[PDB]
Amino acid sequence: EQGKISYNPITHESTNTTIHMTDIKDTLTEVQYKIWRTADGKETAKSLSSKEKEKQFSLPFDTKEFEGKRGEFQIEAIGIKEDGKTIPLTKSAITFEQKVPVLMYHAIDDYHGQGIKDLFVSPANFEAQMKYLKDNGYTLLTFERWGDINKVNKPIFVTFDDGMKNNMNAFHVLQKLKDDTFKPVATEYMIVNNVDAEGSLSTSDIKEMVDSGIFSMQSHTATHADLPKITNYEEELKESKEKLEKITGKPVIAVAYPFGHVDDKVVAETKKYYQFATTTKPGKFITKGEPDELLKMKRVRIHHTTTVEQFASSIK
Ligand SMILES: [Zn+2]
């Protein structure tokens, strides 16, 4: 209704700032800022008062005042007159960017000597890892909720590469762990030409995974192409997306680069067709506002030998 909330510029590395108000029309003795973390809910709000009238009702803000937590904080300001009358001012928000681990799995199966050992995580160990997420308040997301990474507690993306049939084991584990509190979701990056192939997810598997609300079915190209070395970008990137959309009935907005192989040319081609692209560069993503950063997203590799302790250290 009146006034404008501003704050000293922050970056993704910032932990604090100072809030100010300008353009106030009423005469005030005090401004009260009601602040809460979106992720924790308005019911958890506190109110912080400034009587620094000569300094635009300056209010120091530090994430230390909110248990060291980050993400989006909502701000509602009211003014107080000398006689105590309250005056509605305005609302805004400030976001301290949260890190987002993007986990990379391949096979979820008991290894029996067939295939590349490191790329197998047993269903038992996968369950233990997912149970860790469940027990520690992580919010599992898919790229349809990219806009929510700062609006939830402990955002994390569980992803699988290739569309192996054994990923139905991961699906079943997630169905088991799902309950009134834990709402798991995950991304499957499907080698699109392998739908219904021996060893891969079938059309019926994909429909079950998608219809359950658990899986977001995204692209791993048409043939798992070494993108810097191919020229058929429409076939590998565009037509794979289109074919997969016809199968799932849901938008395809994300891809994973086969082998983690990517260069500026590949990013530019990918940008034509996908909003999101993940690499195999190790680490957690954070929003830096860097050019095409969402098409160069780091991932955390899970190994055959990864323990729950190692898993926890790599995401926390
Ligand atoms: Zn792959």
TrEMBL record:
<dbReference type="GO" id="GO:0046872">
    <property type="term" value="F:metal ion binding"/>
</dbReference>
<feature type="binding site">
    <location>
        <position position="224"/>
    </location>
    <ligand>
        <name>Zn(2+)</name>
    </ligand>
</feature>
<dbReference type="GO" id="GO:0016810">
    <property type="term" value="F:hydrolase activity, acting on carbon-nitrogen (but not peptide) bonds"/>
</dbReference>
<dbReference type="Pfam" id="PF01522">
    <property type="entry name" value="Polysacc_deac_1"/>
</dbReference>
<keyword id="KW-0479">Metal-binding</keyword>
<dbReference type="InterPro" id="IPR002509">
    <property type="entry name" value="NODB_dom"/>
</dbReference>
<feature type="binding site">
    <location>
        <position position="220"/>
    </location>
    <ligand>
        <name>Zn(2+)</name>
    </ligand>
</feature>
<feature type="binding site">
    <location>
        <position position="162"/>
    </location>
    <ligand>
        <name>Zn(2+)</name>
    </ligand>
</feature>
<dbReference type="GO" id="GO:0005975">
    <property type="term" value="P:carbohydrate metabolic process"/>
</dbReference>
<dbReference type="GO" id="GO:0005576">
    <property type="term" value="C:extracellular region"/>
</dbReference>
<feature type="domain" description="NodB homology">
    <location>
        <begin position="154"/>
        <end position="316"/>
    </location>
</feature>
<protein>
    <submittedName>
        <fullName>Polysaccharide deacetylase-like protein</fullName>
    </submittedName>
</protein>
<dbReference type="InterPro" id="IPR011330">
    <property type="entry name" value="Glyco_hydro/deAcase_b/a-brl"/>
</dbReference>
<dbReference type="InterPro" id="IPR051398">
    <property type="entry name" value="Polysacch_Deacetylase"/>
</dbReference>
<keyword id="KW-0862">Zinc</keyword>
<keyword id="KW-0732">Signal</keyword>
